[PDB]
Amino acid sequence: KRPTVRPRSDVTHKQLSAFGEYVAEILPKYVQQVQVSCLDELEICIHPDGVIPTLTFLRDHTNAQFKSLADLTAVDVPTRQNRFEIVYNLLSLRFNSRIRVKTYADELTPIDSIVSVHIAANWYEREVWDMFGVFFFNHPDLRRILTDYGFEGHPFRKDFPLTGYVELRYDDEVKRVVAEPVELAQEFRKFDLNSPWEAFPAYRQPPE
């Protein structure tokens, strides 16, 4: 009816909530949270040691059949104890559905790699280790995939600077491309683009 508001359907929300209850009661050992968003997307947040049983059940169950891994990524929220929230997006072609599985890690607790479940997880976990520094157990070849050779630090972490620490330039005295500490002719101008008036009252946090 409203041409500027995205139409919503409650049937998909109900089916995803029912399947969330189904998965949560099938796997109470690892499932910590089940939520369905307003955008009709299902998220199950699990303990880090249950990633292998959860992914294996979701792939090889008859009622799940999530045989395709859409992606594997990490989100750096450096205000919680386990700062890396690791996200698995999975696709079910049999039932035409999408699911999200979330887990957590910090800088010193690796989680189990799911290469034995999905082969794309090999390169995706290599990307996660290269960008965030999350180690993965039982990976066949865990190494850097996107950064330069010998690059120190994980650049997709929050505390890493945007411009980095070193740059490359060609030196004629040594006839080589060499790395120097960062100096910019024009510094990146940080913009404070945040209005001090609350935009969404539905997400108003209680005071501390």
Binding site: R143, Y149, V174
Partner: peptide, 24 residues
């Protein structure tokens, strides 16, 4: 991983000589 990246020649002469900082 640095050792393996040195075994199999992926680091070059420049990448090896970045450890010395001879231009800094």
């Amino acid at each position: 991983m640095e050792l393996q990246e040195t075994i199999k020649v992926w680091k070059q002469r420049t990448h090896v000589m970045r450890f010395f900082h001879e231009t800094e």
